[PDB]
Amino acid sequence: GMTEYKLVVVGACGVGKSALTIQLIQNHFVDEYDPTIEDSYRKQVVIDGETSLLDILDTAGQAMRDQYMRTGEGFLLVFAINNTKSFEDIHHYREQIKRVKDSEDVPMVLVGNKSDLPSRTVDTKQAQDLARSYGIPFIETSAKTRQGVDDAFYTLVREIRKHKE
Numbered sequence: 057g058m059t060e061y062k063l064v065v066v067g068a069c070g071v072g073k074s075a076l077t078i079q080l081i082q083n084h085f086v087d088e089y090d091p092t093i094e095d096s097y098r099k100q101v102v103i104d105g106e107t108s109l110l111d112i113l114d115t116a117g118q119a120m121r122d123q124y125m126r127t128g129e130g131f132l133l134v135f136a137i138n139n140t141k142s143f144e145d146i147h148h149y150r151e152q153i154k155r156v157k158d159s160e161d162v163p164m165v166l167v168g169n170k171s172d173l174p175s176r177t178v179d180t181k182q183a184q185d186l187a188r189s190y191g192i193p194f195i196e197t198s199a200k201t202r203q204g205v206d207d208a209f210y211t212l213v214r215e216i217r218k219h220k221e
């Protein structure tokens with residue numbers, strides 16, 4: 057009966073939801089993943105000395121969403137730093153989560169993915185400011201280089217712990 061955390065990764069098509077999830081678990085960068093595959097992925101982690109099982113839903117669908125959202129304990133809000141629309145979508149993802157959870161206090165982390173890319177359309181400042189207003193952590197990640205990937209998920213677990221403690 058080990059501690060489990062139900063995590064849900066959300067965000068627009070092509071932001072790197074699958075790449076982040078697979079990097080975390082497999083330590084491998086998928087250069088392309090079938091965008092129709094929605095599945096749960098398991099990971100055993102130790103975070104600040106506490107061992108736990110992560111049950112991570114990598115969302116892809118475009119019914120049972122309400123249920124995974126309802127049972128989800130923490131949400132990774134992923135955008136890509138070279139996709140302004142994906143950043144604008146964040147607001148709506150957050151709103152839907154609050155709506156179905158019927159709670160203003162839901163563990164979430166804002167993730168700006170593709171930090172390895174030489175060009176970007178979303179400033180760090182913009183993302184930092186948004187996260188500041190939401191009162192949630194902001195992490196820049198690269199599923200390719202692995203920069204910040206562990207930290208993004210670990211930070212989400214720490215937010216879930218705070219919420220429960």
Ligand SMILES: *CCC(=O)N1CC(NC(=O)Cn2c(C3CC3)c(C(=O)N3CCc4c(cccc4OC)C3)c3cc(Cl)cc(C)c32)C1
Nearest residue numbers: 066067068069070091092115116117118145148149152153
């Ligand atoms: C290319 C395949 C892929 O990765 N994806 C992600 C995208 N699928 C979803 O976003 C499914 N979805 C929705 C559906 C309307 C799109 C919602 C939702 O109800 N939102 C509220 C309205 C809204 C959202 C995002 C952008 C713009 C919006 O309206 C202006 C979000 C979802 C909420 C969550 Cl928490 C998760 C998911 C998967 C989701 C195809």
Ligand SMILES: Nc1nc2c(ncn2[C@@H]2O[C@H](COP(=O)(O)OP(=O)(O)O)[C@@H](O)[C@H]2O)c(=O)[nH]1
Nearest residue numbers: 069070071072073074075086087170198199200
């Ligand atoms: N350069 C770079 N490419 C990435 C990164 N993360 C994902 N990608 C690529 O962007 C595309 C979309 O990634 P994917 O995980 O399928 O996005 P999803 O639709 O959100 O699940 C794929 O070609 C990935 O290889 C990243 O951190 N850096």
Ligand SMILES: [Ca+2]
Nearest residue numbers: 073074091116
């Ligand atoms: Ca995907």
Ligand SMILES: [Ca+2]
Nearest residue numbers: 190191192193
């Ligand atoms: Ca907060």
